[PDB]
Ligand binder design. Structure first.
Ligand SMILES: *[C@@H]1O[C@H](CO)[C@@H](O)[C@H](O)[C@H]1NC(C)=O
Ligand SMILES: *[C@H]1O[C@H](CO)[C@@H](O)[C@H](O)[C@H]1NC(C)=O
Ligand SMILES: *[C@H]1O[C@H](CO)[C@@H](O)[C@H](O)[C@H]1NC(C)=O
Length: 231
């Protein structure tokens, strides 16, 4: 996250730290056994850490998990960038609520353009050139008119939200992918892609639009067979 500050230690109980093949991502605990992240974060041998804040001062209740179930959309476009960038993972064992662990559930509605959203992650706080923080950084950004992302980007995927600061300066960045966009207290986005360097004016982040995936998520977790992703 560029242009933010250290998150409050208590404001991200649903935030998962996802490590796969040395690559860093965020994720969101949506109930006691399941995490939503970006499918692009599935880079191999995934370890999912819950209840983490400082990577160098471990919360007493921090836990390590790995995927026991893993789902994503099988029909993805090839012409858009990271189409349907979402992956739903069931953890190997549940994680109970604790000081630093609690799920964030499914949004009741997609967010209005203009809504203030929190972004968060352990991703770089500088761009270009990686500077990885020991603590997750958080910033407030907004849901932007989708046309802003359409103007900034080539093959923008559908089922996405455009979020950032129109003038730049605050943004997610490398290492934050898969992490949540929380707007008005609701889990609305999973970071997929954005501009590099990060936080440029009119080059917002592209967040998979969680609301659109409600049926898919519920279908998978509720056990009814071979759900389908939204168009
Ligand atoms: C679609 O684009 C991806 C980029 O990730 C590339 O790996 C792949 O070769 C493309 N699909 C086809 C039809 O080759
Ligand atoms: C690990 O997997 C990712 C998949 O995207 C790849 O980028 C990376 O090169 C791999 N690392 C190794 C050991 O080559
Ligand atoms: C990091 O990359 C950027 C250009 O992409 C540049 O500003 C810098 O010279 C590189 N590394 C450093 C810190 O010197």
């Amino acid at each position: 996250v560029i242009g933010g500050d250290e998150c409050n230690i208590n404001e991200h109980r649903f935030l998962a730290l996802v490590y796969a093949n040395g690559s860093l991502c965020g994720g969101t605990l949506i109930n006691q056994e399941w995490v939503l992240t970006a499918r692009h974060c599935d880079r191999g041998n995934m370890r999912i850490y819950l209840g983490m804040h400082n990577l160098k001062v471990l919360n007493k209740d921090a836990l390590r998990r790995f995927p026991k179930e893993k789902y994503f959309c099988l029909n993805t476009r090839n012409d858009t960038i990271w189409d349907k960038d979402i992956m739903l993972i069931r953890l190997n064992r549940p994680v109970r609520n604790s000081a630093h662990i609690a799920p964030l559930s499914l949004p009741s509605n997609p967010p209005s353009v203009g809504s203030v959203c929190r972004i968060m992650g352990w991703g770089t706080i500088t761009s270009p050139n990686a500077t990885l923080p020991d603590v997750p950084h958080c910033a407030n950004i907004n849901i932007l008119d989708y046309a802003v992302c359409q103007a900034a980007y080539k093959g923008l995927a559908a089922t996405t939200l455009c979020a950032g600061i129109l003038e730049g300066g605050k943004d997610t960045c490398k290492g934050d992918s898969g992490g949540p966009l929380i707007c008005n207290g609701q889990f609305q986005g999973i970071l997929s892609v954005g501009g590099n360097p990060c936080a440029q004016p009119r080059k917002p982040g592209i967040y998979t639009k969680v609301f659109d995936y409600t049926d898919w998520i519920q279908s998978i977790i509720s056990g009814n067979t071979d759900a389908t992703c939204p168009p």
